[PDB]
C-alpha cells in the first residue's frame, strides 16, 4: 500500500491530524498497535484550551462537544485555610476553558474517521520506520503474521512517549531535557455529582488534591501520592477519607462520595526533545514531550503541534512549498517551553515536596499569596491557564 | 543615664528611627560600636523605593537627596543576546525608584542628628541588654573603660546581622529560615561616567553582571563570583575585562573604565527570624532579616520596619496605646516575606548556578522570556521592583 502521510498511533494526536488532513484532501493512513477498545479505555485529560476547541470545530468534529462540554470561566486555588477564585474570563481578556473528557474527544474523532472511510489499521504490530532521509520513506508492520509495507512521503509520529518514532531518530541528533518528580497522582473516576461547578486545586500539608468533573453526574478527583504506592493499597474508602482530609472543611462536607469506575496512578515528569523531527519524520504530542498534569497542558500541546503540522503540510502539498516543514520544530518548541515553564510552576507551588527546609516552605506559601493577591499575578495564571496564543 | 527608646546601632535603620522619633518629641539615645568614619566607609546600597524616599522627606532629611538623587523610570534586563527594558513608571501605575548612595543617606542622617543635639555614643563597647521583659529594661556598655548603664522603656535593635540584639532573645523563642547562595558579588566603585542612564542587570553564561551608578561621574559595577575568590585576586584590569565579557557587545564598547575607589565581595544569603521582638526589644533592619542584593530590598526593608516601629511607638507614647506594639512583627513579616520571595526570584533567574542540568537551564531562560514578554509578567516585576505598598 501507499499513502501520502503515514500516521503512527491512533491517540488524540494521530486522529486529529488524520481528520484535518483528510478533510483537506491529503490522504493519510493511521497505524495503531492496540485495539480501539483499549484506546477508549484511557481516562487521562479533561480540560481543553480554547484554541483546541476551535481546532475540533475546524476538524468538523464538534457537535457533541458543543452540547456536552462545559465552559468554565473560573478555577479555584485553596491554600492554608483560604479558597481563592481566579476569574479566567476577565483576567484573560474574555477567554475560557472547556471541560470535556479526553476519552470523549477520542470517541468523537474515531466516529468521524470510521464514517469518512479513511484508512485505519488497528493491531498493527512491529511497526518499523525506514528511509527517514530519502525522498520515499516507508513503514513496515505485521497484521496477523504478514509483513506489509506502506510507502508514503511523510510520517507523523503520534505514537506517544513509548512510541517507536522517537527511537527511530539517531540518538546523536536529539538533545533531551528531563525532570522526574518524586511523586505521582492517584486519580479516581466516579459517577457522582461534582463538589463544585468549577475546579478546585488544593495545596495541603498532606499533599495536593484536585476536584474535577466530566459532567453534572460524573466527577474526577486526584490526590498526590509517593511513587512507592500501589493502587491496590488504596481502596475507595481510603481515597475518599484522604481526599476529604486535604480539602476545605466546607467543601469536604458537601462531597458526595461513591464507588469508583476507574482508579490509577500516573507519575509526574517533564520531558522535551530537541529537535522534533528527522528527515521526513515529524514528532507530535507525547512522542516529543511530556508535562506534569498540573496545568492541564498535555492534550493541549498535542493539539497545538498537530495544528502547526497540518498547516505546514497543506502549504507543502497544495501550495507546493515543502521548505516550510523545516521550521516545524522552531514553531512548536516556543510554545512547548512556555507550557513546560507554567506546568513546572503550577507543580512546584501546589505539591508538597519531600525534604524541604523551612525557607522553601515559606517561599511556596508566599508564591501563592503573591500571585493570588496581585492583579498582575492573577493575570499570569489566567493567560497561561486558558492558553497562550497559537503562533 | 536614662532615655525613652534606646537604639543599638548607628547604621541607616538606627539613625532613621532616631530622627523620626526625635522629631516627634520621643527622646532616644543611639549606641554605636564603631566610629562615624568606619560607618561612612561602607558603600553597600544605591537604590531606594519611593516609600523610603517619602520617609526621608518626613524625617526632614531630603534637601540633598532631592537635589542629587536620580529618578529612574525604567531598568534593563539583558539575556541571550537581547536587552529588554522594563518601563517601571507605566507598568507600576506611575511609580519610580531613586538612585542615591546608602553612604549619602547615612551622611545626611548623621548631619541631621548632630545638629539636633540628640544623644549619640560612638565607640560604645560591650553592649549588653538587660531585663527585656520587665517594665524597666536597661542597656550597659563601656566608654573608654567605664561601665555605664542606660535606663529606657524600649530598645530598638538596629545593630545589623552580627549585632547583639538578636543574640539577646532566647534561642527557643525564635524560629529561623535561612538560605545561603553558592556565590557572592564582587562590587567595584569607580569615578567614571556610567554606561547607561538606567541600570542593566545581565544574565550571562559566565555569571551575572550589574551596571549601576551613584552619579553622572560615578559608577558602581558588580560581577558574580564563587565564594572561594579573594578580592586581592581581582585586579582592576581583570574586573573590567570580566565585566566586558558578560555584557552586550554594544554596551561593552561604550564602557569607560578606570581605577577603583572601592572593591569588595559580598556573599549572598536569605534570612528571616520569627518573631522580630521580645518583651521590650524590637528588631529592625538586618538584625532581623537578610536578602540577596539582587532586587535591592535590604536598605528598603530596613526603612519599612523602622516606619512601622516609629508609628506604633507614637501611638504608645502620645496616644497612650502601648498594646499596638504587640502587632509589630505581624505587620512587618508580611512585607518581609513578599520582599524575600521577589529577591529570591530575581536571584534565581539572573545568576548562573553551579550543577544545573539542561532542563533547569531552559526553565531559567524561559522564565526570563515569559516575564519580559508578557504584559502581565512585566507588571509583576515593576510593582515589586518599585516596591509594594506600605500597610
Ligand atoms: C499514563 C498517562 C496518563 C496521563 N494522564 C493525564 C492526566 O491525568 N491528565 C492530563 O491532563 N493529561 C494526562 N496525560 C497526557 C495526555 O493524555 C496526553 O498528553 C495525550 O494522550 C497525548 O496524546 P498523544 O496522541 O500524543 O499520545 P497518546 O494518547 O499516548 O496516544 C499514542 C498512541 O500511540 C499508539 N502507539 C504507541 N506506540 C506505538 C507503536 N510503536 N506502534 C503503533 N502505535 C503505537 C498507542 O497505542 C496510543 O494509541 C496522560 C498521559 C499518559 C501517557
Ligand atoms: C556586607 C554587606 C553588604 C551589603 N551590600 C549590599 C549591596 O551590595 N547592595 C544592597 O542593596 N544592599 C546591601 N546590603 C544591605 C544593606 O546595606 C543593609 O540592608 C542595610 O545596611 C541595613 O541597615 P541596618 O541599619 O539594619 O544595618 P547596618 O548598615 O549593618 O547597621 C548596623 C550598625 O550596627 C552597629 N553595631 C553592630 N553590632 C553592634 C553592637 N553589638 N553594638 C553596637 N552597635 C553595633 C554596626 O557597627 C552598624 O553601624 C549589604 C549589607 C551588608 C551587611
Ligand atoms: N490539571 C488538571 C485539571 C483537570 C484534570 C481532569 O482530569 O479533569 C486533570 O487531569 C488535570
Ligand atoms: N540590585 C541592585 C541594584 C543596584 C545596586 C547598587 O549598588 O547600585 C545594588 O547593590 C544592587
UniProtKB/Swiss-Prot annotation, chains A, B:
Record-annotated membrane-spanning stretches: none
Cofactor binding remark: Binds 1 FAD per subunit.
Outcome (variant: residue 269 to N): No significant changes in affinity for p-OHB are observed. However, the affinity for NADPH decreases strongly
Consequence of substituting residue 34 to K: Slight decrease of affinity for p-OHB and NADPH
Effect caused by changing residue 33 to K: Slight decrease of affinity for p-OHB and NADPH
UniProt-listed Enzyme Commission number(s): 1.14.13.2
Keywords: Aromatic hydrocarbons catabolism, FAD, Flavoprotein, Monooxygenase, NADP, Oxidoreductase
Name of the protein in question: p-hydroxybenzoate hydroxylase
Enzyme class: oxidoreductase
One biological process term in Gene Ontology: benzoate catabolic process via hydroxylation
Record GO terms (molecular function): 4-hydroxybenzoate 3-monooxygenase (NADPH) activity; 4-hydroxybenzoate 3-monooxygenase activity; FAD binding; flavin adenine dinucleotide binding
Amino acid at each position: 500500500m501507499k499513502t501520502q502521510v503515514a500516521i503512527i498511533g491512533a491517540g488524540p494526536s494521530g486522529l486529529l491530524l488524520g481528520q484535518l488532513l483528510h478533510k483537506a484532501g491529503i490522504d493519510n493512513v493511521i497505524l495503531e498497535r492496540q485495539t480501539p477498545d483499549y484506546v477508549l479505555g484511557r481516562i487521562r485529560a479533561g480540560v481543553l484550551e480554547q484554541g483546541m476547541v476551535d481546532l475540533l470545530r475546524e476538524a468538523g468534529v464538534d457537535r457533541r462537544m458543543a452540547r456536552d462540554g462545559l465552559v468554565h470561566e473560573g478555577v479555584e486555588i485553596a491554600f492554608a485555610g483560604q479558597r481563592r477564585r481566579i476569574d479566567l474570563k476577565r483576567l484573560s481578556g474574555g477567554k475560557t476553558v472547556t471541560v470535556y473528557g479526553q476519552t470523549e474527544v477520542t470517541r468523537d474523532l474515531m466516529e468521524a474517521r470510521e464514517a469518512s472511510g479513511a484508512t485505519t489499521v488497528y493491531q498493527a504490530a512491529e511497526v518499523r520506520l525506514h528511509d527517514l532521509q530519502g525522498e520515499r520513506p516507508y513503514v513496515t508492520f505485521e497484521r496477523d503474521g504478514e509483513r506489509l509495507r506502506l510507502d508514503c512521503d511523510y510520517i507523523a509520529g503520534c505514537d506517544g512517549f513509548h512510541g517507536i518514532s522517537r527511537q527511530s531518530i539517531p540518538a546523536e541528533r536529539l538533545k533531551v531535557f528531563e525532570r522526574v518528580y518524586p511523586f505521582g497522582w492517584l486519580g479516581l473516576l466516579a459517577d457522582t455529582p461534582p463538589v463544585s461547578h468549577e475546579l478546585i486545586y488544593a495545596n495541603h500539608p498532606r499533599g495536593f488534591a484536585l476536584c474535577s468533573q466530566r459532567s453534572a453526574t460524573r466527577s474526577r478527583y486526584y490526590v498526590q501520592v509517593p511513587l512507592t504506592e500501589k493502587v491496590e493499597d488504596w481502596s475507595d474508602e481510603r481515597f475518599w477519607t484522604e481526599l476529604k482530609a486535604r480539602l476545605p472543611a466546607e467543601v469536604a462536607e458537601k462531597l458526595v462520595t461513591g464507588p469508583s469506575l476507574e482508579k490509577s496512578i500516573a507519575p509526574l515528569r517533564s520531558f522535551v526533545v530537541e529537535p522534533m523531527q528527522h528527515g521526513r519524520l515529524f514528532l507530535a504530542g507525547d512522542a516529543a514531550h511530556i508535562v506534569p498534569p498540573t496545568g492541564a497542558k498535555g492534550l493541549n500541546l498535542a493539539a497545538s503541534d498537530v495544528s502547526t503540522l497540518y498547516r505546514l503540510l497543506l502549504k507543502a502539498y497544495r501550495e507546493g512549498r515543502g521548505e516550510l516543514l523545516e521550521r516545524y520544530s522552531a514553531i512548536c518548541l516556543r510554545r512547548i517551553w512556555k507550557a513546560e515553564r507554567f506546568s513546572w510552576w503550577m507543580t512546584s507551588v501546589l505539591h508538597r515536596f519531600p525534604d524541604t527546609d523551612a525557607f522553601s516552605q515559606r517561599i511556596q506559601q508566599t508564591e501563592l499569596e503573591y500571585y493570588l493577591g496581585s492583579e498582575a499575578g492573577l493575570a499570569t495564571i489566567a493567560e497561561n491557564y486558558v492558553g497562550l496564543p497559537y503562533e
